[PDB]
Write a protein that binds this ligand. Sequence first.
Ligand code: HEM
Ligand code: HEM
Ligand SMILES: Cc1cc(N)nc(C[C@@H]2CNC[C@@H]2OCC/C=C/c2cccc(F)c2)c1
Ligand SMILES: Cc1cc(N)nc(C[C@@H]2CNC[C@@H]2OCC/C=C/c2cccc(F)c2)c1
Ligand SMILES: C[C@H](O)[C@H](O)[C@H]1CNc2nc(N)[nH]c(=O)c2N1
Ligand SMILES: C[C@H](O)[C@H](O)[C@H]1CNc2nc(N)[nH]c(=O)c2N1
Ligand SMILES: [Zn+2]
Lengths: 411, 407
Amino acid sequence: RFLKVKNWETDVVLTDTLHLKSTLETGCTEHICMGSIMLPVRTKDQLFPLAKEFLDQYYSSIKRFGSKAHMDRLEEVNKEIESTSTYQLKDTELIYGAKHAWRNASRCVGRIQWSKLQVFDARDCTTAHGMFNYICNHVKYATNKGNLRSAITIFPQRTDGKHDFRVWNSQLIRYAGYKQPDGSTLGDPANVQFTEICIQQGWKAPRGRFDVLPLLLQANGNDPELFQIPPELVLEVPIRHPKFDWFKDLGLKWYGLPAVSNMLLEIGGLEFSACPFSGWYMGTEIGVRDYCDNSRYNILEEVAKKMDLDMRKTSSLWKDQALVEINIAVLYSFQSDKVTIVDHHSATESFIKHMENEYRCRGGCPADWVWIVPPMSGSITPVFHQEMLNYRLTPSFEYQPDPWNTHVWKG
Amino acid sequence: RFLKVKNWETDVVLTDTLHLKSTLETGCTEHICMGSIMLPTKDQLFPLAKEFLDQYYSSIKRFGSKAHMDRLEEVNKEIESTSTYQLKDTELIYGAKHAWRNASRCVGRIQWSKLQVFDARDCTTAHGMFNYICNHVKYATNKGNLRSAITIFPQRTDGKHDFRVWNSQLIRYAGYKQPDGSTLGDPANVQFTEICIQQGWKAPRGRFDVLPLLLQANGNDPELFQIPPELVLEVPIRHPKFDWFKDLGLKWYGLPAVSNMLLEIGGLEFSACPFSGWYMGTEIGVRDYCDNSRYNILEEVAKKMDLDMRKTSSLWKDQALVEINIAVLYSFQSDKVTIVDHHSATESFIKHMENEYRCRGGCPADWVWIVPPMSGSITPVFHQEMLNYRLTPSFEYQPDPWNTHVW
Ligand code: HEM
Ligand code: HEM
Ligand SMILES: Cc1cc(N)nc(C[C@@H]2CNC[C@@H]2OCC/C=C/c2cccc(F)c2)c1
Ligand SMILES: Cc1cc(N)nc(C[C@@H]2CNC[C@@H]2OCC/C=C/c2cccc(F)c2)c1
Ligand SMILES: C[C@H](O)[C@H](O)[C@H]1CNc2nc(N)[nH]c(=O)c2N1
Ligand SMILES: C[C@H](O)[C@H](O)[C@H]1CNc2nc(N)[nH]c(=O)c2N1
Ligand SMILES: [Zn+2]
């Protein structure tokens, strides 16, 4: 069956057939759409079909489907599963797997870059000190003195689910938030709980507005251990505005490297519960969300005051005005310091090109519209007007519950 | 089977049960989500009739009363005999209000119960349609102080005797195919503007020409009517700070009035039910003024503000978009024509969502339409999970009449 998507700005009509390879479920039914819901141990029995599915995909892509090497590899995996109960990915399969998880990430506007992904193989890792080193190296390689390169580091897969590798941080680099006795927060409000855990675990907190949190790392199902990224490995950008000279005295800065560490990479049935990955920012992730959610730094008031906007009625659009100025300041700063960043206009445009190309070359591109359209100026970006189809392909990145909810404490 | 919705800004969790009475299909499956697609006999009539009357009598606290069973019988009898039935005034008023209450794509539903309903079921001709519509326009406009209303022409019969209002809105500007190659007026309306010309309209060929109504009665060929100019309240667009804004020659109309939808109540189909409320600012300033395929004035505005249009990263589009929208609100306010801004309106839908969760057990909402087309994440609806499902009575899209009318 063929499914058509229309762009209402251009009238371009695309045809999806790739949704026919979709496996996992969406959360939706014929009676309810759960399209705006944020969140809508594996036996031999289920594992070989998944391995087989993945390996048929790998071997088609390299143009060897049906070859001896393909059959022999099916055979080899088959055996390994029924004798040790799991199996090991080859280097080529792991690289391919991790690229495709990104390619299949329907909530990711940056996918035009999916084939340029430096894969770091950390499957020989055994301790939390080992993980630290691996993560320091990724951070240095990815940062690259401001010329950001996309990368992922992949630690040993799940075994019995009692011996998991996890990164407890939700991003490798993030600012502490501290809830004060008066009910206010210093630093990033989103990170308060993580920051209490670290403090509990022994971290001595400076207690400023921008403290880079320590990594909290779990190897082999063991209790997590604290480590401090070397500051010289943490590129930061002070934020200033091209026209407004008072902007800088707001005291704002941000880190250059966005690096998601709390997700689970599934490849061919295997579960990599520690796979920190990193790319580069779209400006609005900082200027819209990080600075301007009420539940984050919430600097909109202070910025509108200083621009002397009429603040006594929402209808002056003072919030909208302040938000655009802040975002200007974020792109200006990153650009001035030569730290890679992309604006939301250029990023949505690249995506639509990527999306069309994926339809022509792959029969589709699963895309989640709620996530792809930027969180300011939606309708003046070309994705707003693009119909999309959302579906789940493997390999894939998945959410997992935070580890402090599920960890069996040892000693 | 009971479903939770979380607000990520407040942590407020609401529990939806209303979806279990969801009747129609969404377009999604367990394999594919279609959340972002624009358009995803006697034997069926009685169930539909029954389901509706059941909710009506429940609403008036008379579920399973003599009056209730008596009516179910009376309707059951009318259908068996006539193949259709007629709604009581009270049923029709309740049905229209609930079609709006159930509009998953409408941010303005806090207002659903203040809807003045005009029963035009006795209408027989286009001239009659025209009279009813002018009365609707004048009543709803109310010299700038807008009031919600719907006018309801006679229901579908054998489907070759449909009443349709061919315009997509009661009041829209003309769009013209030009020798130049570009587009004069509103490009949304080009086709329809040509159908009017082609039935005899005398286009004045300007940027802002109020289109003539094309009305169809009892499946007849449609006719033209010029809404009296003095009933069309228009607003000149100026900026509270930029003196030059005026010189762009921008105006919009005060009355948003959708006329191309099909209202379905208890299985009955009202193919002509133009309805109107009042504008959210962004509807004119973001979409009407700034869409590529619309008036598309951002470049012209950015220029007058002397912004750096060399690179997209100066955010020149975004800056101009805010100002264009500031001017829309300011103008409507200055001329005292009701408008709501997107902050105020989404904050209202949130309180209305809460009320519906506690009073009705839920609220179908299409997040993709609810979240404004500018500044999404700074409005509270950005962070609010929503469930989308189809309840009846409802408004539905229908084929544009010309594609269908046997001429
Ligand atoms: C090249 C630079 C990249 C850019 C500009 C980019 C852009 C984005 C943005 C703006 C989001 C949504 C964040 C939000 O608004 O909450 C996102 C989500 C995501 N991206 Fe990327 N991305 C990039 C690289 C990558 C990489 C390297 C990966 C992993 C290989 C990745 C995988 C994902 C995933 C899994 C999500 C969903 C996150 C979640 O569900 O919490 N992206 N992308
Ligand atoms: C009272 C002020 C009202 C406000 C502020 C309002 C707001 C809106 C907005 C902003 C949209 C999205 C429009 C778009 O972006 O295309 C919309 C859609 C809609 N509203 Fe309202 N509304 C109002 C009154 C009404 C009334 C009186 C009705 C019916 C009685 C109604 C029913 C609908 C329907 C069916 C849609 C979806 C139309 C479509 O799918 O194209 N609304 N509303
Ligand atoms: C590699 C990468 C590049 C890039 N530009 N952006 C991303 C993803 C972004 C980066 N900053 C945070 C975001 O990750 C998701 C954060 C929130 C998501 C979330 C999802 C589910 C539940 C929840 F609580 C939160 C990743
Ligand atoms: C009553 C009302 C008030 C209000 N503020 N807004 C609305 C709905 C708005 C009025 N202007 C645009 C929108 O009407 C329908 C928009 C287009 C929808 C559409 C649906 C299917 C196909 C298509 F081409 C277009 C209705
Ligand atoms: C493709 C997508 O479904 C389409 O562009 C939608 C997106 N959201 C919208 N939201 C509103 N309010 N109005 C619209 O016309 C649309 N168009
Ligand atoms: C409720 C809703 O699904 C949720 O708040 C989403 C909306 N869109 C988003 N879009 C992006 N890019 N990132 C997000 O975190 C969210 N949050
Ligand atoms: Zn869906």
